[PDB]
Write a structure and sequence with these properties.
The structure is cut from a larger assembly and holds 3 copies of chain A, 4 copies of chain B, 1 copy of chain F, 1 copy of chain H, 1 copy of chain I and 1 copy of chain J. By secondary structure, chain H is mainly α. Chain H contains 2 helices and no strands. Chain H has one domain. The chains are: A alpha+beta, B mainly alpha, F mainly beta, H mainly alpha, I alpha+beta, J alpha+beta. Bound molecules: zinc ion (2 copies). Chain C: Component of the RNA polymerase I (Pol I) complex consisting of 14 subunits. Chain C: It is found in: Nucleus, Nucleolus.
Chain lengths: 48, 49, 49, 145, 343, 45, 48, 68, 95, 317, 49
């Protein structure tokens, strides 16, 4: 499958039980689409 | 026991030209190279052919 | 049948092997291949099955 | 390398010695929506072979729990405030304006809160908007003897 | 198996793990590395002799070939990160030169294979008569199509330059590894008896690999872990003397594994380092009449520290002492080999 | 032309491209390249 | 010794030769060994 | 390889404190306590210049530019 | 942005969360100690979201009389006076 | 909301309760007692000593030629680790290069050191003695050869105190005939929290003064045992005409918390070991940079400065 | 054993009567037991400790 990374995994107690850490390489490299509407144009502007 | 260091350093600076310092590594490799020596000498190939 | 048997570690470091070279490996294309020892039934000893 | 919390561990059945986990990312919005709602970690709190809970706090947290709940532990003002706050961590999780505390279990001649008082303080500061207080009686693991 | 101190205090599965996993330490594969064209070699920049060592470890002469380092391991569950078999790594020690791995990847290039058939030897290394790009080619590749010695390479960049004779247009092959590597030596492997062109190059890339979060470490009893957070040096615990323990192991990991041999090793190390001894730890020496623990403890109380091995440690972030004392030993952490390539 | 090293004898051999590689005195069949003067920077980390 | 000699049935002061001969009779067959080990592990688990 | 300047746990400098340690075992007939004359009181900065393999002097005898 | 007030502050500015950037326990702990010597404060504890990113969440709950900003100001002045006393005695010690 | 009414802040009472004494002070080591200070301030003083105060160190290293055995990145690292003697406040900070990166050096920011040694064969050696100090000239690349290069104004700025390496005898690399090292190291200012090589003081740490008190006075040979447990000097056997032998705690500052007694079966009743909660015993051993007096003074100075910083940036709001 | 420990030290070496490597294989008799045949083995490609 595309859009799916993989790594060896260390523990962290500080984040949450919900949340998961994501290293910078996965963040900067894992992409997903976002439609652009009236009210989040500002965010996508900053993004690009 | 104590750290053999002065022997280590003196073997490092000028390697021993007499005999390989740690003989038991050779006695560990002994099986293979002795089988091959027994190939060449001690008449192994000759008997076969 | 090699040119290193009995050579004292000085004559080894003067060549390009490491002092306590142990030898025992056939070299093939540069990847030192070796014959694992296997285990066989006992020689000549008439056993039951 | 990614980072997770101890809690989920006993579910994924990893020892975190250096084993590795696939991270996926559903692209569209239908998929991530149904995922976020049906399969959000807390919403899988009961393993479905039986009813018993499969998540939980683990080794350090549990024995330090036996050391904090124990009646022999007393905290002053400074340590109590600091510890309660470290437990809550409001802003990043959110939801609250100002934290509320309990009065000290023993007061004179020095003000010393007790540990179980702090576990109760946490249970309070996560109280829902208007839900009546919890009550429970159930056997612990460490036998009393 | 013999060179695992106190090998007779461990639950045999753990001695089995430590055996099978010591055979993969990132240790010194020898001393002649300039003349080894092997594919992937690992060298541990700063290894040192174990302070606890079974005398056979000197007899077989391993000291030529050390495997790992000696870390002041404080058994403690303080950071909170080091649970579930992981551990920590004191950042100051991690930057002052703890196990500082160096990978060697020697990749070879052979124009002999790529010629189709028929026409004679065609391709050669270098810059064919004609122009060459300036932007990266002339930066890296010297003049002979052989790269500058020691220039840092990034994935998208050439390593060797060869050209067909017919088209006369230089081809290129880039460094297909995805991690900044260096170049140490390039060997122009002559073909044979003689009278031939350079038909093979051998470029030995020296990747550098410091301990990155995930790089497994291991004591000599089966406690393979992960470097989890690289905790800052000032936020670590500390004793009445001042030594920040360099690597924090987890207490909840010793039961359910039966590696009490490791605690014994801690005692032995803190004894050996103090006086200047090399504590003999061959299996089966110390019998039930007098425990090994008692002997090493006599040694320690001689040196000045507590007799069970304990030591009083003040925490780092609060400044007050830990109510109960803590355990500090001197263990041998033969670093493992699984860090970034696998991950 | 470049400068190399005989692997065994260690002698500068100055071979030019499209040539018979060999040690001009040894008969050996391997040559290392030598590191020239080059300005590289490395952070002290 | 007590448990084993009891399972085979001979006394504790038994003759060594007859004891050994019985034992030899014991573990050529294999089911009697399961009996012996049941009894022996019984006594040992008691001691433990 | 070379002595690990600035020992791991503490921050003391021990670079120069090996070539003057080695010529104590060498010619003073002393034991491992020799290093105590060097000013190493802890036992972190003491498991550095005691049990360090100087594995360079066995490696520098490999110059390719031997000229011999 | 050294100190920025996080968005949970009550309108009365009675329960504010300072967020000091580029700082760790080194100042957080001692500042908390000095603040707790102040009677009119009800709650003052410090935390860190994640040690990698150097952000220290502070937090002060105060009595209705004085707002928390003035409390922090006085606490910082008091910590400075503490260091003043320490340096005074210290530099008196040696010649 | 409960304050206990004895925790009131009062600068006069605090300043009066505080006491400092300096046991020993040398050019390198300093041991002194602070007292009347709560734990957190001791933790802060220790932290600022280790982490926060600045000191020059070799950040960048430009190699022009390095054919030595030692890996190049290893050699740059190990050069960086050496310490340099220059009062770190005579310089400014280094504005780090964002894009637009080259023109980022000035005479106040960075100082340059340079070394170069080519190990050439020494022929005067009679026989084979691989010292190798005698077989080869310039064999061991020392630290003392890192000879500073003045950059303009600096030649008169630091004329009174030359910017030199702290220890002229550290080993940096090792050579044999034929190879060479040639490089220049750019040294800048640094804050220890980023990297350890900046931290001026190697070892700065404290102990809470132990307290030994004998509940029931021991007798006779047990006096020998009790003197023998703790290290020398801290336990005297009292010359008392009544009876024959007892033991009392002379001076505990030398003692370690080792807790040897409490293991004994018979002693456990007779002695406790506690800790004076407000007596703090600092030890600070410098590395090569500055007199530890200046270290501690500048450490509390740095705390003062960071408090001023947060104070002003608050005053803005 | 006797002739071997003689062969090590001073006594001259004649052809070894019984070679040290030999393992004399006495198989005792017993009911329902391994068949008893005295086994005097003298070949290589075995294990010897
Ligand atoms: Zn040649
Ligand atoms: Zn140290």
């Amino acid at each position: 499958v595309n859009y799916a990374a993989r790594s060896v995994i260390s523990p962290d107690p500080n984040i949450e039980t919900n949340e998961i850490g994501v290293p910078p390489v996965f963040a900067t490299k894992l992409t997903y689409p976002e439609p652009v509407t009236l009210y989040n144009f500002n965010e996508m502007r900053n993004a690009v | 026991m104590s750290f053999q260091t002065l022997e280590r350093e003196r073997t490092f600076k000028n390697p021993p030209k007499d005999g390989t310092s740690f003989p038991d590594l050779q006695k560990a490799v002994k099986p293979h190279v002795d089988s091959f020596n027994a190939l060449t000498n001690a008449g192994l190939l000759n008997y076969a052919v | 049948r090699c040119h290193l048997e009995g050579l004292s570690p000085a004559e080894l470091i003067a060549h390009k092997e490491e002092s306590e070279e142990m030898g025992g490996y056939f070299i093939v294309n540069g990847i030192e291949k070796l014959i694992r020892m296997l285990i066989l039934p006992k020689r000549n000893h008439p056993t039951a099955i | 390398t990614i980072r997770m919390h101890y809690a989920n561990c006993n579910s994924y059945n990893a020892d975190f010695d250096g084993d590795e986990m696939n991270m996926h990312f559903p692209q569209s919005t239908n998929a991530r929506s149904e995922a976020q709602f049906i399969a959000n970690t807390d919403s899988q709190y009961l393993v479905p072979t039986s009813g018993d809970p499969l998540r939980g706090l683990i080794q350090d947290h549990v024995v330090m729990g036996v050391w904090l709940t124990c009646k022999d532990t007393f905290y002053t003002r400074d340590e109590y405030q600091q510890l309660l706050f470290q437990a809550l961590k409001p802003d990043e999780t959110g939801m609250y304006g100002r934290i509320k505390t309990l009065p000290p279990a023993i007061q004179r001649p020095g003000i010393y809160w007790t540990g179980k008082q702090i576990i109760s303080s946490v249970l309070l500061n996560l109280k829902p908007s208007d839900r009546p207080g919890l009550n429970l009686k159930s056997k612990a693991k460490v036998p009393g003897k | 198996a013999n060179m695992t101190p106190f090998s007779d205090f461990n639950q045999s599965p753990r001695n089995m793990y430590q055996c099978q996993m010591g055979k993969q330490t990132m240790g010194t594969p020898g001393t002649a590395l300039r003349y080894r064209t092997d594919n992937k070699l690992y060298r541990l920049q700063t290894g040192q002799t174990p302070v606890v060592r079974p005398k056979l470890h000197n007899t077989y002469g391993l000291d030529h070939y050390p495997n790992g380092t000696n870390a002041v391991v404080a058994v403690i569950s303080y950071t909170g990160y080091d649970m579930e078999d992981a551990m920590i790594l004191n950042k100051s020690a991690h930057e002052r030169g703890f196990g500082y791995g160096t990978v060697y990847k020697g990749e070879s290039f052979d124009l002999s294979q790529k010629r189709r058939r028929g026409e004679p030897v065609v391709h050669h290394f270098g810059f064919a008569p004609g122009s060459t790009p300036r932007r990266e080619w002339l930066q890296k590749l010297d003049a002979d199509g052989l790269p500058f010695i020691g220039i840092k390479l990034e994935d998208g960049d050439p390593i060797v330059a060869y050209y067909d004779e017919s088209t006369g247009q230089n081809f290129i092959e880039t460094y297909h590894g995805t991690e900044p590597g260096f170049v140490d030596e390039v060997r122009l492997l002559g073909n044979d008896v003689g009278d031939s062109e350079c038909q093979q190059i051998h470029v030995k890339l020296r990747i550098t690999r410091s301990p990155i979060i995930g790089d497994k470490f291991s004591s000599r009893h089966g406690q393979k872990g992960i470097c989890s957070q690289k905790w800052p040096t000032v936020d670590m615990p500390f004793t009445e003397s001042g030594m920040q323990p360099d690597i924090i192991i987890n207490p909840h990991a010793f039961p359910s594994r039966m590696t009490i041999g490791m605690f014994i090793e801690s005692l032995a190390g803190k004894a050996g380092a103090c006086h200047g001894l090399a504590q003999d730890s061959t299996p089966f020496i110390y019998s039930e009449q007098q425990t090994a623990a008692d002997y090493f403890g006599e040694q320690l109380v001689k040196a000045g520290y507590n007799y069970h091995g304990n030591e009083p440690m003040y925490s780092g972030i609060t400044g007050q002492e830990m109510k109960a004392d803590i355990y500090i030993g001197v263990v041998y952490y033969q670093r493992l080999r699984h860090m970034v390539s696998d991950k | 032309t470049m400068i190399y090293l005989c692997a065994d004898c260690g002698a500068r051999n100055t071979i030019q491209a499209k040539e018979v590689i060999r040690c001009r005195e040894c008969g050996h069949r391997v040559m290392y390249k030598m590191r020239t003067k080059r300005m590289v920077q490395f952070e002290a980390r | 010794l007590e448990a084993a000699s009891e399972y085979v049935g001979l006394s504790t002061d038994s003759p060594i030769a007859l004891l050994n001969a019985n034992l030899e009779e014991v573990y050529r067959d294999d089911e009697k060994l399961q009996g012996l080990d049941a009894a022996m592990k019984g006594k040992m688990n008691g001691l433990t | 390889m070379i002595i690990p300047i600035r020992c791991f746990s503490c921050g003391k400098v021990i670079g120069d404190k090996w070539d003057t340690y080695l010529t104590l075992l060498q010619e003073d007939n002393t034991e491992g306590e020799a290093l105590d004359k060097l000013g190493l009181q802890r036992y972190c900065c003491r498991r550095m210049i005691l049990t360090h393999v100087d594995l360079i002097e066995k490696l520098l005898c490999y110059n390719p530019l031997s000229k011999q | 942005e050294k100190i920025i007030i996080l968005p949970g502050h009550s309108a009365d500015l009675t329960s504010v969360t300072f967020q000091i950037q580029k700082e760790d326990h080194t100042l957080g702990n001692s500042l908390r100690y000095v603040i707790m010597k102040n009677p009119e404060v009800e709650f003052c504890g410090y935390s860190i979201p994640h040690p990698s990113e150097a952000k220290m969440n502070f937090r002060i709950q105060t009595a209705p009389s004085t707002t928390a900003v003035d409390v922090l100001r006085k606490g910082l002045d008091d910590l400075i006076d503490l260091c003043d006393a320490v340096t005074e005695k210290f530099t008196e010690q040696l010649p | 909301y409960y304050f206990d009414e004895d925790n009131i802040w009062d600068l006069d009472k605090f300043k009066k309760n505080l006491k400092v004494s300096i046991t020993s002070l040398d050019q390198e080591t300093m041991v002194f007692e602070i007292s009347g200070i709560d734990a957190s301030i001791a933790n802060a003083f220790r932290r600022i000593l280790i982490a926060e105060i600045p000191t020059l160190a070799f950040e960048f290293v430009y190699i022009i030629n390095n054919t030595s055995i030692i890996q190049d990145e290893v050699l740059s690292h190990r050069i960086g680790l050496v310490p340099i003697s220059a009062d770190p406040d005579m310089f400014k900070w280094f504005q780090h290069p964002l894009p637009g990166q080259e023109a980022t050096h000035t005479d106040y920011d960075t100082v340059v050191f340079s070394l170069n040694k080519k190990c050439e064969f020494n022929k005067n050696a009679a026989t084979d003695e691989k010292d190798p100090k005698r077989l080869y000239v310039n064999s061991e690349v020392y630290s003392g050869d890192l000879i500073w290069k003045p950059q303009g104004r600096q030649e008169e700025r630091f004329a009174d105190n030359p910017i030199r390496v702290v220890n002229p005898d550290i080993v940096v690399a090792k050579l044999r005939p034929g190879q060479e090292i040639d490089l220049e190291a750019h040294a800048i200012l640094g804050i220890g929290q980023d990297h350890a090589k900046f931290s001026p003081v190697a070892t700065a740490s404290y102990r809470l003064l132990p307290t030994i008190h004998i509940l029931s006075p021991i007798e006779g040979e047990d006096a020998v045992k009790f003197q023998k447990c703790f290290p020398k000097g801290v336990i005297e056997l009292e010359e008392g005409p009544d009876g024959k032998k007892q033991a009392r705690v002379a001076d505990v500052r030398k003692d370690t918390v080792s807790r040897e007694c409490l293991r004994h079966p018979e002693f456990a009743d007779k002695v406790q070991l506690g800790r004076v909660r407000d007596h703090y015993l600092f030890s600070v051993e410098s590395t090569g940079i500055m007199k530890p007096d200046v270290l501690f003074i500048k450490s509390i100075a740095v705390l003062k400065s960071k408090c001023l910083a947060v104070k002003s940036s608050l005053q803005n709001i | 054993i006797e002739y071997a420990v003689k062969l090590r030290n001073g006594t001259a070496t004649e052809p070894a009567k019984v070679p040290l490597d030999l393992e004399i294989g006495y198989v005792p008799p017993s009911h329902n037991g391994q068949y008893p045949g005295l086994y005097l083995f003298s070949n290589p490609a075995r294990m010897v400790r």
